[PDB]
């Protein structure tokens, strides 16, 4: 059986989000992409280092906003304006939130050498598309 990105059915008590619920055959039929970088089009050079930096961003922001990122991020990349739009929860204090925003806001700018911008989007509870 195919076991790639398919959360199996439990007993009907398993909260799950649109992203996790959809399987890889819906990857742009129903889901779309979580990272919008241009390198995977027909003619371009640097797609490999874009992905190497992509997995880095996913894991840095995962370990730097500890246990508050509701679902996964949207690493869009237009011009030299990398963007880390988020869906972060409403549990930690806003001064801590603004702090980790600033810390990231400048640290990825000095790691990747371009404008990096985080536009958080606070949400009360981790969303549920269906209970599996």
């Amino acid at each position: 059986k195919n076991r790639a990105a398919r959360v199996r059915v439990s007993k009907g008590d398993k909260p799950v989000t649109y992203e996790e619920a959809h399987a890889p055959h819906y990857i742009a039929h129903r889901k779309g992409w979580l990272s919008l970088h241009t390198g995977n089009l027909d003619g371009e050079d640097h797609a490999a280092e874009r992905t190497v930096e992509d997995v880095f961003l996913r894991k840095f922001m995962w370990g730097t906003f500890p246990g508050c990122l509701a679902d996964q991020l949207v690493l869009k990349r237009r011009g030299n304006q990398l963007e880390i739009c988020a869906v972060v929860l409403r549990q930690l204090s806003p001064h801590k939130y603004y702090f980790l925003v600033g810390y990231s806001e400048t640290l990825l700018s000095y790691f990747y050498k371009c404008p990096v911008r985080l536009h958080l989007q606070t949400v009360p509870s981790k969303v549920v598309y269906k209970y599996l």
Binding site: W33, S35, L36, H37, T38, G39, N40, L41, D42, G43, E44, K76, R77, R78, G79, E83
Partner: protein, 122 residues
Amino acid sequence: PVVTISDEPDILYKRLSVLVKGHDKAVLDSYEYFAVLAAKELGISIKVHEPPRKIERFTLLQSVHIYKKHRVQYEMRTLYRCLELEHLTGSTADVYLEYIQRNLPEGVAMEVTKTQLEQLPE
């Protein structure tokens, strides 16, 4: 509104054609509307064209150790939309081209622009 009219006669751009490569036709034709209405109120003559999509399909194995008969196949949809500007001015260039360039979409956006500037022989 700093303008600074400086010195030398124009560069006379003929046929600044923008070829827009993308992963998503809905972003490409929204872009077509944004550029077509901008050229309408810019005064610059635009035309539309659809350079046909190329699919980069390729095959990998599905299981980690064995079973070469069971394979996965992945594909890239690269679509093109050509937006060819004809009979436009050098000043007209780095203001329209600039507006669009800054207001480009994300990973589904490329703006390959060829310029045919005219000139006198020497």
